[PDB]
Coordinates of N, CA, C and O and ligand atoms in Angstrom, one line a residue:
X1 N 0.8 -1.2 0.0 CA 0.0 0.0 0.0 C 0.9 1.3 0.0 O 1.7 1.5 -0.9
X2 N 0.6 2.1 1.0 CA 1.2 3.4 1.0 C 1.0 3.9 2.4 O 0.0 4.6 2.7
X3 N 1.8 3.3 3.3 CA 1.4 3.0 4.6 C 1.9 4.1 5.5 O 1.6 4.0 6.7
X4 N 2.7 5.1 5.0 CA 3.4 6.1 5.8 C 2.4 7.0 6.5 O 2.5 7.2 7.7
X5 N 1.3 7.3 5.8 CA 0.2 8.1 6.3 C -0.5 7.4 7.5 O -0.7 8.0 8.6
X6 N -0.8 6.1 7.4 CA -1.5 5.4 8.5 C -0.6 5.2 9.7 O -1.1 5.1 10.8
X7 N 0.8 5.3 9.5 CA 1.7 5.1 10.6 C 1.8 6.4 11.4 O 1.9 6.3 12.7
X8 N 1.7 7.6 10.8 CA 2.1 8.8 11.4 C 1.0 9.8 11.7 O 1.1 10.5 12.7
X9 N -0.1 9.8 10.9 CA -1.2 10.7 11.1 C -1.8 10.6 12.5 O -1.9 9.5 13.0
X10 N -2.2 11.7 13.1 CA -3.1 11.7 14.3 C -2.6 12.8 15.3 O -1.7 13.6 14.9
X11 N -3.1 12.7 16.5 CA -2.7 13.6 17.5 C -1.9 12.9 18.6 O -2.5 12.0 19.2
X12 N -0.7 13.3 18.9 CA 0.2 12.6 19.8 C 0.5 13.4 21.0 O 0.8 14.6 20.9
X13 N 0.4 12.9 22.3 CA 0.7 13.6 23.5 C 2.0 13.1 24.1 O 2.2 11.9 24.1
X14 N 2.8 13.9 24.7 CA 4.1 13.5 25.2 C 3.8 12.7 26.4 O 3.0 13.0 27.2
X15 N 4.6 11.6 26.6 CA 4.5 10.8 27.8 C 5.9 10.6 28.5 O 5.9 10.2 29.6
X16 N 7.0 10.9 27.8 CA 8.3 10.9 28.5 C 9.3 11.7 27.7 O 9.2 11.9 26.5
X17 N 10.4 12.0 28.4 CA 11.5 12.9 27.9 C 12.8 12.6 28.6 O 12.9 12.4 29.8
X18 N 13.9 12.6 27.8 CA 15.3 12.5 28.4 C 16.1 13.6 27.8 O 16.1 13.9 26.6
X19 N 16.8 14.3 28.7 CA 17.9 15.2 28.2 C 17.4 16.2 27.2 O 18.2 16.7 26.4
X20 N 16.1 16.6 27.2 CA 15.7 17.7 26.4 C 16.3 19.0 26.8 O 16.6 19.8 25.9
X21 N 16.4 19.3 28.1 CA 17.1 20.5 28.5 C 18.5 20.6 27.9 O 18.8 21.6 27.3
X22 N 19.2 19.5 28.1 CA 20.6 19.4 27.6 C 20.6 19.6 26.1 O 21.5 20.3 25.5
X23 N 19.6 19.1 25.3 CA 19.6 19.2 23.9 C 19.4 20.6 23.5 O 20.1 21.2 22.7
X24 N 18.5 21.3 24.2 CA 18.2 22.7 23.9 C 19.4 23.6 24.2 O 19.7 24.5 23.4
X25 N 20.1 23.4 25.3 CA 21.3 24.1 25.7 C 22.3 24.0 24.5 O 22.8 25.0 24.0
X26 N 22.5 22.8 24.0 CA 23.5 22.5 23.0 C 23.1 23.3 21.7 O 23.9 23.6 20.9
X27 N 21.8 23.5 21.4 CA 21.3 24.1 20.2 C 21.4 25.7 20.4 O 21.2 26.5 19.5
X28 N 21.7 26.1 21.7 CA 21.9 27.5 21.9 C 20.7 28.2 22.6 O 20.7 29.4 22.7
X29 N 19.7 27.4 23.0 CA 18.4 28.1 23.5 C 18.7 28.7 24.9 O 19.5 28.2 25.6
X30 N 18.1 29.9 25.1 CA 18.2 30.6 26.4 C 17.7 29.9 27.6 O 16.8 29.0 27.4
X31 N 18.1 30.2 28.8 CA 17.9 29.4 30.0 C 16.5 29.5 30.4 O 16.0 28.5 30.9
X32 N 15.8 30.6 30.3 CA 14.4 30.7 30.6 C 13.5 30.0 29.6 O 12.7 29.2 29.9
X33 N 13.8 30.3 28.3 CA 13.0 29.6 27.2 C 13.2 28.1 27.3 O 12.2 27.4 27.1
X34 N 14.4 27.6 27.6 CA 14.6 26.2 27.8 C 13.6 25.6 28.8 O 13.0 24.5 28.6
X35 N 13.5 26.2 29.9 CA 12.8 25.7 31.1 C 11.3 25.6 30.8 O 10.7 24.6 31.0
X36 N 10.8 26.7 30.3 CA 9.4 26.9 30.0 C 9.0 25.9 28.8 O 7.9 25.4 28.8
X37 N 9.9 25.8 27.8 CA 9.6 24.9 26.7 C 9.6 23.5 27.3 O 8.8 22.7 26.9
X38 N 10.6 23.2 28.2 CA 10.6 21.8 28.8 C 9.3 21.5 29.6 O 8.9 20.4 29.6
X39 N 8.7 22.5 30.2 CA 7.5 22.3 30.9 C 6.2 22.2 30.0 O 5.2 21.7 30.5
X40 N 6.4 22.7 28.8 CA 5.2 22.8 27.9 C 4.5 21.5 27.5 O 3.3 21.5 27.3
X41 N 5.3 20.4 27.4 CA 4.7 19.1 27.0 C 3.7 19.3 25.9 O 2.5 18.9 26.0
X42 N 4.1 19.8 24.7 CA 3.1 20.1 23.6 C 2.7 18.8 22.9 O 3.5 17.9 22.8
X43 N 1.5 18.8 22.4 CA 1.0 17.8 21.5 C 1.6 18.0 20.1 O 2.0 19.1 19.7
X44 N 1.6 16.9 19.3 CA 2.2 16.9 18.0 C 1.1 16.3 17.1 O 0.8 15.2 17.1
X45 N 0.6 17.2 16.2 CA -0.4 16.8 15.3 C 0.2 16.7 13.9 O 0.6 17.7 13.3
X46 N 0.1 15.5 13.4 CA 0.6 15.2 12.0 C -0.5 14.9 11.1 O -1.5 14.3 11.5
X47 N -0.4 15.5 9.9 CA -1.5 15.4 8.9 C -0.9 15.3 7.5 O 0.3 15.6 7.3
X48 N -1.7 14.9 6.5 CA -1.2 14.6 5.2 C -2.2 15.1 4.2 O -3.4 14.9 4.4
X49 N -1.8 15.7 3.1 CA -2.6 16.2 2.1 C -2.0 16.1 0.8 O -1.3 17.0 0.4
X50 N -2.2 14.9 0.2 CA -1.5 14.6 -1.0 C 0.0 14.3 -0.7 O 0.3 13.5 0.2
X51 N 0.9 15.0 -1.3 CA 2.3 14.9 -1.1 C 2.8 15.8 0.1 O 3.9 15.7 0.5
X52 N 1.9 16.7 0.6 CA 2.2 17.6 1.6 C 1.9 17.2 3.0 O 0.7 17.0 3.3
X53 N 2.9 17.1 3.8 CA 2.8 16.6 5.2 C 2.9 17.8 6.1 O 3.8 18.7 5.8
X54 N 2.2 17.8 7.2 CA 2.2 18.9 8.2 C 2.4 18.3 9.6 O 1.9 17.3 9.9
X55 N 3.3 19.0 10.3 CA 3.5 18.7 11.7 C 3.3 19.9 12.6 O 4.1 20.9 12.5
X56 N 2.3 20.0 13.4 CA 1.9 21.0 14.2 C 2.3 20.6 15.7 O 2.2 19.5 16.0
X57 N 2.8 21.6 16.4 CA 3.0 21.4 17.9 C 2.2 22.4 18.6 O 2.4 23.6 18.3
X58 N 1.4 22.0 19.6 CA 0.5 22.9 20.3 C 0.7 22.8 21.8 O 0.6 21.8 22.4
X59 N 1.0 24.0 22.4 CA 1.0 24.2 23.8 C 0.4 25.6 24.1 O 0.4 26.4 23.2
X60 N 0.1 25.9 25.3 CA -0.3 27.2 25.7 C 0.9 28.2 25.5 O 0.7 29.3 25.2
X61 N 2.1 27.7 25.7 CA 3.3 28.5 25.6 C 3.6 28.9 24.1 O 3.8 30.1 23.9
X62 N 3.6 28.0 23.2 CA 3.9 28.3 21.8 C 3.3 27.3 20.9 O 3.4 26.1 21.1
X63 N 2.8 27.7 19.7 CA 2.5 26.9 18.6 C 3.6 27.0 17.5 O 4.2 28.0 17.3
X64 N 3.8 25.9 16.8 CA 4.6 25.9 15.6 C 4.0 25.0 14.6 O 3.0 24.3 14.9
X65 N 4.5 25.0 13.4 CA 3.9 24.3 12.2 C 4.8 24.3 11.1 O 5.4 25.3 10.7
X66 N 5.0 23.1 10.5 CA 5.8 23.0 9.3 C 4.9 22.2 8.3 O 4.3 21.2 8.6
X67 N 5.0 22.6 7.0 CA 4.5 21.8 5.9 C 5.6 21.5 4.9 O 6.4 22.4 4.7
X68 N 5.7 20.3 4.4 CA 6.8 20.0 3.6 C 6.5 18.9 2.6 O 5.5 18.1 2.8
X69 N 7.3 18.8 1.6 CA 7.4 17.6 0.8 C 8.7 16.9 1.1 O 9.7 17.5 1.5
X70 N 8.6 15.5 0.9 CA 9.8 14.7 1.2 C 10.9 14.9 0.1 O 10.6 14.8 -1.1
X71 N 12.1 15.2 0.6 CA 13.2 15.4 -0.3 C 13.4 16.9 -0.6 O 14.4 17.3 -1.1
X72 N 12.3 17.7 -0.4 CA 12.4 19.2 -0.6 C 12.8 19.9 0.6 O 12.2 19.7 1.7
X73 N 13.8 20.8 0.4 CA 14.3 21.7 1.4 C 13.3 22.9 1.5 O 12.7 23.3 0.5
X74 N 13.2 23.4 2.7 CA 12.3 24.5 3.0 C 12.8 25.3 4.2 O 13.6 24.8 5.0
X75 N 12.4 26.5 4.3 CA 12.7 27.4 5.4 C 11.7 27.1 6.5 O 10.6 26.8 6.3
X76 N 12.2 27.1 7.8 CA 11.5 26.8 8.9 C 11.8 27.7 10.1 O 13.0 28.1 10.2
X77 N 10.8 28.1 10.9 CA 11.1 28.9 12.1 C 10.9 28.0 13.3 O 9.8 27.5 13.5
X78 N 11.9 27.8 14.0 CA 11.8 26.8 15.1 C 11.2 27.5 16.3 O 11.1 28.7 16.5
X79 N 10.9 26.6 17.3 CA 10.2 27.0 18.5 C 10.9 28.0 19.3 O 10.3 28.8 20.0
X80 N 12.3 28.1 19.3 CA 13.0 29.1 20.0 C 13.3 30.3 19.1 O 14.0 31.3 19.5
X81 N 12.9 30.3 17.8 CA 12.9 31.4 16.8 C 14.2 31.5 16.1 O 14.5 32.5 15.6
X82 N 14.9 30.3 15.9 CA 15.9 30.2 14.9 C 15.4 30.1 13.5 O 14.4 29.3 13.2
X83 N 16.0 30.8 12.5 CA 15.7 30.6 11.1 C 16.6 29.4 10.7 O 17.8 29.4 10.9
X84 N 16.0 28.4 10.0 CA 16.8 27.2 9.7 C 16.3 26.7 8.3 O 15.3 27.0 7.8
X85 N 17.2 25.8 7.7 CA 16.9 25.2 6.4 C 16.7 23.7 6.7 O 17.7 23.1 7.2
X86 N 15.6 23.1 6.3 CA 15.2 21.8 6.8 C 15.0 20.8 5.6 O 14.3 21.2 4.7
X87 N 15.4 19.6 5.8 CA 15.0 18.6 4.8 C 14.5 17.3 5.5 O 15.2 16.8 6.4
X88 N 13.4 16.8 5.1 CA 12.8 15.6 5.7 C 12.6 14.6 4.6 O 12.0 14.8 3.6
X89 N 13.1 13.4 5.0 CA 13.1 12.2 4.1 C 12.5 11.0 4.8 O 12.5 11.0 6.0
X90 N 12.1 10.0 4.0 CA 11.6 8.8 4.6 C 12.6 7.7 4.4 O 12.6 7.1 3.3
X91 N 13.4 7.3 5.4 CA 14.5 6.4 5.3 C 14.2 5.2 6.2 O 14.1 5.2 7.4
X92 N 13.8 4.1 5.5 CA 13.4 2.9 6.2 C 12.2 3.0 7.0 O 12.0 2.3 8.0
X93 N 11.3 3.9 6.7 CA 10.0 4.0 7.4 C 10.1 5.0 8.6 O 9.2 5.2 9.3
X94 N 11.3 5.6 8.7 CA 11.5 6.6 9.7 C 11.5 8.0 9.0 O 12.1 8.1 8.0
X95 N 10.9 9.0 9.6 CA 11.1 10.4 9.2 C 12.3 11.0 9.8 O 12.5 11.1 11.0
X96 N 13.2 11.4 8.9 CA 14.5 12.0 9.2 C 14.5 13.4 8.8 O 14.4 13.7 7.6
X97 N 14.7 14.3 9.7 CA 14.5 15.7 9.6 C 15.9 16.3 10.0 O 16.3 16.1 11.1
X98 N 16.5 17.0 9.0 CA 17.7 17.7 9.3 C 17.5 19.2 9.2 O 16.8 19.8 8.4
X99 N 18.2 19.9 10.1 CA 18.2 21.3 10.3 C 19.6 21.9 10.1 O 20.5 21.5 10.9
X100 N 19.8 22.7 9.1 CA 21.1 23.4 8.9 C 20.9 24.9 9.2 O 20.0 25.6 8.7
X101 N 21.8 25.4 10.0 CA 21.9 26.9 10.2 C 23.3 27.3 10.7 O 23.9 26.6 11.6
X102 N 23.8 28.4 10.2 CA 25.1 29.0 10.6 C 26.2 27.9 10.6 O 27.0 27.9 11.5
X103 N 26.2 27.0 9.6 CA 27.2 25.9 9.5 C 27.0 24.8 10.6 O 27.8 23.9 10.7
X104 N 25.8 24.8 11.3 CA 25.5 23.7 12.2 C 24.4 22.9 11.6 O 23.7 23.3 10.7
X105 N 24.2 21.7 12.3 CA 23.1 20.8 11.9 C 22.6 20.1 13.2 O 23.3 19.6 14.0
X106 N 21.2 19.9 13.2 CA 20.7 19.0 14.2 C 19.8 18.1 13.4 O 19.2 18.4 12.3
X107 N 19.6 16.8 13.9 CA 18.8 15.8 13.3 C 17.7 15.4 14.2 O 17.9 15.1 15.4
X108 N 16.4 15.3 13.7 CA 15.3 14.8 14.4 C 14.6 13.6 13.7 O 14.0 13.7 12.7
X109 N 14.7 12.5 14.4 CA 14.1 11.3 13.9 C 12.8 11.0 14.6 O 12.7 11.1 15.8
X110 N 11.8 10.6 13.8 CA 10.5 10.3 14.3 C 10.1 8.9 13.8 O 10.0 8.7 12.6
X111 N 10.0 7.9 14.7 CA 9.8 6.5 14.4 C 8.7 5.9 15.2 O 8.6 6.1 16.4
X112 N 7.8 5.1 14.5 CA 6.8 4.3 15.2 C 7.4 3.0 15.7 O 8.1 2.4 15.0
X113 N 7.0 2.7 16.9 CA 7.2 1.4 17.6 C 5.9 1.1 18.4 O 5.5 1.9 19.2
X114 N 5.3 -0.1 18.1 CA 4.1 -0.5 18.7 C 3.1 0.6 18.6 O 3.0 1.3 17.6
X115 N 2.4 1.0 19.8 CA 1.4 2.0 19.8 C 2.1 3.4 20.1 O 1.3 4.4 20.4
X116 N 3.4 3.5 19.9 CA 4.1 4.7 20.3 C 4.8 5.4 19.2 O 5.1 4.8 18.2
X117 N 5.1 6.7 19.4 CA 5.9 7.4 18.4 C 7.1 8.1 19.1 O 6.9 8.8 20.1
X118 N 8.3 7.7 18.7 CA 9.5 8.0 19.5 C 10.3 9.1 18.7 O 10.6 8.8 17.5
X119 N 10.7 10.1 19.4 CA 11.4 11.2 18.7 C 12.8 11.3 19.3 O 13.0 11.4 20.5
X120 N 13.8 11.3 18.4 CA 15.2 11.4 18.9 C 15.9 12.6 18.2 O 16.0 12.7 17.0
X121 N 16.4 13.5 19.1 CA 17.0 14.7 18.6 C 18.5 14.7 19.0 O 18.9 14.6 20.1
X122 N 19.3 14.9 17.9 CA 20.8 14.8 18.1 C 21.4 16.1 17.7 O 21.2 16.7 16.6
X123 N 22.3 16.6 18.6 CA 23.1 17.8 18.3 C 24.5 17.6 19.0 O 24.7 17.8 20.2
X124 N 25.5 17.3 18.1 CA 26.9 17.0 18.5 C 27.0 16.1 19.7 O 27.5 16.4 20.7
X125 N 26.4 14.9 19.6 CA 26.4 13.9 20.6 C 25.8 14.4 22.0 O 26.3 13.9 23.0
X126 N 24.9 15.3 22.0 CA 23.9 15.4 23.0 C 22.6 14.8 22.3 O 22.3 15.2 21.2
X127 N 22.0 13.7 22.9 CA 20.9 13.0 22.3 C 19.7 13.1 23.3 O 19.8 12.8 24.5
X128 N 18.6 13.6 22.8 CA 17.4 13.6 23.5 C 16.3 12.6 23.0 O 16.2 12.5 21.8
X129 N 15.6 12.0 23.8 CA 14.6 11.0 23.4 C 13.2 11.3 24.1 O 13.1 11.3 25.3
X130 N 12.2 11.5 23.2 CA 10.9 11.8 23.7 C 9.9 10.7 23.2 O 10.0 10.4 22.0
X131 N 9.0 10.3 24.0 CA 8.0 9.3 23.6 C 6.6 9.9 23.6 O 6.2 10.7 24.4
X132 N 5.7 9.5 22.6 CA 4.4 10.0 22.5 C 3.4 8.8 22.3 O 3.8 7.8 21.7
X133 N 2.2 9.0 22.8 CA 1.1 8.0 22.6 C 0.0 8.7 21.8 O 0.0 10.0 21.8
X134 N -1.0 8.0 21.2 CA -2.2 8.7 20.6 C -3.0 9.3 21.7 O -3.1 8.7 22.8
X135 N -3.6 10.5 21.4 CA -4.4 11.2 22.4 C -5.9 11.3 21.9 O -6.0 11.3 20.7
Ligands
O1L1 O1 11.1 21.1 17.1 C1 11.1 20.1 17.8 C2 9.9 19.3 18.3 C3 8.6 19.8 17.9 C4 8.0 20.8 18.8 C5 8.6 21.3 19.9 C6 8.1 22.3 20.8 C7 8.5 22.4 22.2 C8 7.9 23.3 23.1 C9 6.9 24.2 22.7 C10 6.4 24.1 21.3 C11 7.0 23.1 20.4 C12 10.2 18.2 19.1 O2 9.3 17.3 19.6 C13 11.5 17.8 19.4 C14 12.5 18.7 19.0 N1 12.3 19.8 18.3 C15 13.4 20.7 18.1 C16 13.3 21.8 19.1 C17 12.4 21.7 20.1 C18 12.3 22.8 21.0 C19 13.1 23.9 20.9 CL1 12.9 25.2 22.1 C20 14.0 24.0 19.9 C21 14.1 22.9 18.9 CL2 15.3 23.0 17.6

């Protein structure tokens, strides 16, 4: 079939987090923004419309939103308000999302396992891991 939609679409609520503070520090996020973002526990809404995929994150603190095609690079404004250039691909059924800015790079992987959606953020060997369930 064409199973990528059925795997990822829906509304996901955070249920665990590792070293997110550390990840945000390494990306350069300010100390107050880090803490408040860490407490926000935002939902992640994934949707599909033909070739165009969208990932919304919603909290009382801040909303964000990206729409993209796989393989196409696009400008993105991140939750801490960095301007970045992003490319998202489907590699072995995982969504792999790369962010380039000022000669740096961070990678965000989103992978389904069982009833869960696991997100891994890497920045120069600081690694954060967050788990989500359907809400
Ligand atoms: O963008 C995301 C999201 C999606 C929403 C996050 C998000 C977090 C808090 C509030 C709203 C949205 C994740 O699950 C995990 C990582 N990142 C990267 C990131 C996350 C946070 C910050 Cl500050 C900076 C950066 Cl580069």
